Amino acid sequence: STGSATTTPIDSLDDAYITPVQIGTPAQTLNLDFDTGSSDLWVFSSETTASEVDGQTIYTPSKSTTAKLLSGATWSISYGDGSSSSGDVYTDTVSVGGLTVTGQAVESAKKVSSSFTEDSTIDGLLGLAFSTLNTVSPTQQKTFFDNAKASLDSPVFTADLGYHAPGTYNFGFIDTTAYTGSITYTAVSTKQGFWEWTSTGYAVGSGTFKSTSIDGIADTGTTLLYLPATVVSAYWAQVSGAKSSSSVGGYVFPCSATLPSFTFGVGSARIVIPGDYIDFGPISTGSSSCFGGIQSSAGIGINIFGDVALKAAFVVFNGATTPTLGFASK
Numbered sequence: 001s002t003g004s005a006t007t008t009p010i011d012s013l014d015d016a017y018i019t020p021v022q023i024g025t026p027a028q029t030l031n032l033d034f035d036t037g038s039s040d041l042w043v044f045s046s047e048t049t050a051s052e053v054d055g056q057t058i059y060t061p062s063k064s065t066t067a068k069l070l071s072g073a074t075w076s077i078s079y080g081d082g083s084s085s086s087g088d089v090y091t092d093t094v095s096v097g098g099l100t101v102t103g104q105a106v107e108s109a110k111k112v113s114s115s116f117t118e119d120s121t122i123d124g125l126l127g128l129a130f131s132t133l134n135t136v137s138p139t140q141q142k143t144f145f146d147n148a149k150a151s152l153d154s155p156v157f158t159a160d161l162g163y164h165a166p167g168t169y170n171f172g173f174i175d176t177t178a179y180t181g182s183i184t185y186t187a188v189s190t191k192q193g194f195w196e197w198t199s200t201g202y203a204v205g206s207g208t209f210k211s212t213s214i215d216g217i218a219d220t221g222t223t224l225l226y227l228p229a230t231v232v233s234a235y236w237a238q239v240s241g242a243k244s245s246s247s248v249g250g251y252v253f254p255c256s257a258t259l260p261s262f263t264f265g266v267g268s269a270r271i272v273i274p275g276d277y278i279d280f281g282p283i284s285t286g287s288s289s290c291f292g293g294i295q296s297s298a299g300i301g302i303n304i305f306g307d308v309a310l311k312a313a314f315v316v317f318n319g320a321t322t323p324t325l326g327f328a329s330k
């Protein structure tokens with residue numbers, strides 16, 4: 001079997017993407033943030049503290065005839081930006097774009113951090129990293145992808161994120177009309193639970209390509225591109241007036257400047273990120289300082305190929321027994 005769902009940016013800056021997901025019987029449709037950097041499927045629910053809910057659609061397990069409480073199970077997660085949530089665990093039927101999994105662990109939030117409450121458009125997260133990162137205790141739970149793997153035509157899913165436009169998540173097949181050229185596959189390390197791979201180098205604008213190994217993770221749940229300080233400094237040095245601002249927390253640049261493109265290597269292939277993808281707009285309403293989409297990973301401890309990079313490509317997450325990542329131009 002296969003599944004296909006449209007994913008839509010939540011705002012004009014592509015800060016995140018939401019995808020409709022059907023949970024329960026009869027279906028309750030929630031818009032979830034598909035996150036290849038985590039492994040929990042958690043939702044706002046009827047059990048969430050009422051003051052912590054501001055416009056989200058909530059999952060109500062008591063209205064689903066297939067929902068079962070997973071006796072004694074709890075979950076608690078903290079994200080790399082300081083966000084967190086926690087609660088209990090149901091199992092229920094979950095469908096994405098026609099692809100149905102029965103008995104999927106649905107983690108019901110009793111408490112969410114402020115950053116989720118303020119994001120009225122995101123009803124929860126659907127984790128697509130490896131199941132070793134799932135936070136359910138005492139019995140660890142499998143991701144939607146892991147549960148679907150057996151019945152998929154091919155154990156893959158693909159991410160085709162749009163620039164200021166809708167995109168597609170496909171499960172179980174590779175749409176050969178959605179990219180140009182060939183797909184370049186590269187090895188994945190699962191040792192930390194992430195879709196971790198090694199980029200073969202980078203170039204700034206029309207400069208020389210610098211061959212150098214950048215280890216990092218493919219993360220649809222992170223907005224920006226976080227790279228080593230040496231790389232990020234070489235990029236922003238080509239932008240007149242750009243500087244690192246401690247009060248803002250990263251590189252900013254004059255909104256009137258034109259940004260150079262950024263190229264990253266995948267084996268012998270090259271993925272080019274247009275300079276416009278790196279503009280994240282004014283730091284405050286009316287400001288003439290704009291926030292950059294390429295930032296240093298020094299404070300984070302790991303390099304992150306977030307949406308800024310992934311939306312420049314067609315990306316194959318190949319969950320075969322030896323996992324690989326595929327990149328194609330589009």
Ligand SMILES: NCc1ccc(C(F)(F)F)cc1
Nearest residue numbers: 037038079080219221222302
């Ligand atoms: N998108 C989920 C996620 C969030 C944070 C991290 C970090 F910061 F720990 F690397 C990885 C993955």
Ligand SMILES: NCc1ccc(C(F)(F)F)cc1
Nearest residue numbers: 035079083115116119221222
């Ligand atoms: N990387 C996971 C993640 C995804 C979304 C959010 C936000 F934006 F909703 F707070 C935080 C963390």
